[PDB]
Amino acid sequence: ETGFVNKDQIAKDVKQFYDQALQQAVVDDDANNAKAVVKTFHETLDCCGSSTLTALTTSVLKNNLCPSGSNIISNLFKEDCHQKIDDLFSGK
Amino acid sequence: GFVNKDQIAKDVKQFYDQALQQAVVNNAKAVVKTFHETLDCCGSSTLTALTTSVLKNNLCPSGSNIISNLFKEDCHQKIDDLFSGK
């Protein structure tokens, strides 16, 4: 209900939703929707991968799930998607 | 343990709507501006009066693109698009 949505919980749920989509996008060759979801998160939030899934990030990059210009080294110097999700809900 | 796409999209729209209300009347202005800039939108078709205030109070980013699609691609649509992968 509008007026009762908790910030910590919604941020947790969005991070979980993202992690679910990323895991499926990597493992499921027919997961056209999951791949589209993570591509949209990555482009919208300017991120690639998450801190809970660091061992996946190179597979994520290889399979063109991150925006142009994203690469292994450059991504190490960027915040991960979970931090970007926190920033969104915190207004930073 | 799965987060349902429709439920989380609904929750995020409600989170935005509350921030919009609070901003027009805390950190609500920063939250609204962040949503607007990140999602490339500036209000909601369901909250037209609040949308007017956003435009009068510089809480919306620049672009003919934003304005041409003010309600055609509003923040609720952008939130839907985020969770649906469009």
UniProtKB/Swiss-Prot annotation, chain B:
Residues 2-86 are extracellular. Changing residue 73 to K/Q: Strongly reduced affinity for HCV protein E2. Changing residue 81 to E: Strongly reduced affinity for HCV protein E2. Expressed on B cells (at protein level). Expressed in hepatocytes (at protein level). Expressed in monocytes/macrophages (at protein level). Expressed on both naive and memory CD4-positive T cells (at protein level). Disulfide bonds join 41-75, 42-60. Not glycosylated. It comes from the Eukaryota. It is found in: Cell membrane; Basolateral cell membrane. Changing residue 13 to E: No effect on integrin binding. The record marks 5, 29, 33 as: Important for interaction with integrin. It is linked to Immunodeficiency, common variable, 6: A primary immunodeficiency characterized by antibody deficiency, hypogammaglobulinemia, recurrent bacterial infections and an inability to mount an antibody response to antigen. The defect results from a failure of B-cell differentiation and impaired secretion of immunoglobulins; the numbers of circulating B-cells is usually in the normal range, but can be low. Belongs to the tetraspanin (TM4SF) family. Structural component of specialized membrane microdomains known as tetraspanin-enriched microdomains (TERMs), which act as platforms for receptor clustering and signaling. Essential for trafficking and compartmentalization of CD19 receptor on the surface of activated B cells. Upon initial encounter with microbial pathogens, enables the assembly of CD19-CR2/CD21 and B cell receptor (BCR) complexes at signaling TERMs, lowering the threshold dose of antigen required to trigger B cell clonal expansion and antibody production. Homodimer. Part of a complex composed of CD19, CR2/CD21, CD81 and IFITM1/CD225 in the membrane of mature B cells. Interacts (via the second extracellular domain) with CD19; this interaction is initiated early during biosynthesis in the ER and enables trafficking of only properly folded CD19. Part of a complex that includes MHC class II/HLA-DR molecules and IFITM1. Interacts with IFITM1. Interacts with IFITM2 and IFITM3. Part of integrin-tetraspanin complex composed of CD9, CD81, beta-1 and beta-2 integrins in the membrane of monocyte/macrophages. (Microbial infection) Plays a critical role in HCV attachment and/or cell entry by interacting with HCV E1/E2 glycoproteins heterodimer. Binds cholesterol in a cavity lined by the transmembrane spans. This is CD81 antigen. It comes from Homo sapiens.
